[PDB]
Amino acid sequence: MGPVWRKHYITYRINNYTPDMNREDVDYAIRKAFQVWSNVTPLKFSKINTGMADILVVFARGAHGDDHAFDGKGGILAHAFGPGSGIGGDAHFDEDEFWTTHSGGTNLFLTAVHEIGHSLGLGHSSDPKAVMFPTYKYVDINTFRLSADDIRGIQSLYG
Ligand SMILES: NC(=O)[C@H](CCC(=O)O)NC(=O)[C@H](CCC(=O)O)NC(=O)[C@@H](CC(=O)NO)Cc1cc(-c2ccc(-c3cccc(Cl)c3)cc2)no1
Ligand SMILES: [Ca+2]
Ligand SMILES: [Ca+2]
Ligand SMILES: [Ca+2]
Ligand SMILES: [Zn+2]
Ligand SMILES: [Zn+2]
């Protein structure tokens, strides 16, 4: 019962890239994270490099221009705004973390799946198996799957 996008074609743009990973790996992680949600909804996501994207993906540090300042290494890893114009939908990742493609540091893909959930209108789950649970936990990314609770949540918003 949070806000939803009132359309099924949603664009995203990667505003900037963490130096922790190569650009191609950031692109891949974000694309795959969007795919997780498109797989179970009518939503389609297209990356754009120019224009006005709905969801802006940002890596930033500390106080970074909104009311949700980061806290340095550890603690909060990322945050995102629910659907709406402007900053609505945007997903922000704390550059003070060490973003990775793997089990070391903080896995970008898994964190992005969680944040994009918020960008689409989901809140937190109390189900410890849900990607929308409030605390990060590395799982085998090649066997990762949305929980039934996550699928219930997103299908209740779209479709
Ligand atoms: N406490 C911890 O274990 C870590 C430690 C961080 C560190 O020191 O490096 N920190 C967090 O988990 C923080 C705690 C923040 C707080 O409440 O104080 N959580 C986050 O930063 C969240 C913040 C948030 O909710 N943003 O919207 C970000 C977050 C949530 C996840 C997510 C990913 C996968 C899963 C998961 C769980 C079970 C199964 C599966 Cl398949 C996946 C569920 C959650 N990824 O990013
Ligand atoms: Ca936006
Ligand atoms: Ca932090
Ligand atoms: Ca970093
Ligand atoms: Zn922010
Ligand atoms: Zn969250």
Swiss-Prot record:
Binding-site list for Ca(2+) 3: 71-72, 74, 76, 94, 97
Statement: the UniProt record of this protein carries the keyword Repeat: yes
The UniProt record lists the keyword Repeat: yes
Protein induction: By exposure to bacterial lipopolysaccharides (LPS). Inhibited by dexamethasone.
Main location: secreted
Chain residues that bind Zn(2+) 1: 64, 66, 79, 92
Gene Ontology terms: cellular component: cytoplasm; extracellular matrix; extracellular region; extracellular space; nucleus
Function of the molecule: May be involved in tissue injury and remodeling. Has significant elastolytic activity. Can accept large and small amino acids at the P1' site, but has a preference for leucine. Aromatic or hydrophobic residues are preferred at the P1 site, with small hydrophobic residues (preferably alanine) occupying P3.
Domain notes: The conserved cysteine present in the cysteine-switch motif binds the catalytic zinc ion, thus inhibiting the enzyme. The dissociation of the cysteine from the zinc ion upon the activation-peptide release activates the enzyme.
Family membership: Belongs to the peptidase M10A family.
Protein name (database record): Macrophage metalloelastase
The species this protein was found in: Homo sapiens
